[PDB]
């Protein structure tokens, strides 16, 4: 299996391609310094037009934590995935307390990579260089792999996806300014061929 997650949706026109491409996750971004920020109400609405198919995630930056864990419950999500700034402590305190969290990092963070090290359910990993030669840059990621739950970010595209998956082999992939038309729009098109891309390393066609 190969968990795909498509984060930072703002419409219901990504949405409808998310749920055609048959992505894991959708990701809806509360977090005001990001160009795919969405208030509370509109995350609930949202939220609720998506089904039981696909996990929801409100996806946090900068939001105090038991704020973030009020705005979880209140949207209706299926997962609280924490940005790289949140401590650890508030990893575990968020765990505690909700039944599904996602701990992101990067690499250059030097971040403990065992999964589940604070609580969370899965690690996001972000490598935002590794795609930034003509070729996936595996050696970025190879023994610092995860044995756990992880998805590989870094910058991922339809252009780049199958390369990086072929290499890394990761548990799941997530995605976002590689499906943009726009900052905060997401390009239905770029939606299906990453999907395809992706899909094609373990099933072509």
């Given at each position: 299996a190969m968990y795909i997650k498509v984060c930072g949706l703002t419409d219901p026109h990504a949405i409808d391609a998310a749920q055609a491409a048959h992505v894991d996750a959708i990701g809806f971004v509360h977090a005001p310094?990001?160009?795919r920020h969405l208030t509370p109400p509109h995350i609930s609405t949202l939220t609720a037009t998506?089904?039981?198919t696909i996990d929801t995630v409100l996806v946090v930056a900068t939001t105090p934590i038991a704020d973030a864990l009020a705005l979880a419950e209140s949207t209706g999500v299926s997962v609280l995935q924490l940005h790289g700034q949140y401590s650890d402590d508030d990893v575990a305190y968020a765990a505690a307390r909700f039944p599904r969290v996602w701990r992101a990092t990067s690499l250059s963070a030097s971040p403990?990579?065992?999964?589940?090290?604070?609580?969370?359910?899965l690690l996001l990993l972000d490598a935002?260089?590794?795609?930034?030669?003509?070729?996936?840059?595996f050696a970025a990621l190879a023994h610092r792999r995860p044995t756990g739950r992880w998805l590989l970010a870094g910058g991922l595209t339809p252009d780049n996806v199958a390369d990086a998956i072929t290499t890394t082999s990761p548990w799941g992939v997530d995605v976002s300014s590689g499906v943009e038309?726009?900052?905060?729009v997401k390009d239905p098109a770029k939606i299906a061929a990453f999907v395809q891309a992706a899909r094609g390393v373990s099933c072509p066609r």
């Open positions: 310094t990001s160009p998506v089904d039981c403990n990579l065992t999964v589940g090290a604070y609580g969370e359910e935002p260089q590794a795609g930034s030669g003509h070729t996936w840059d038309s726009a900052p905060g």
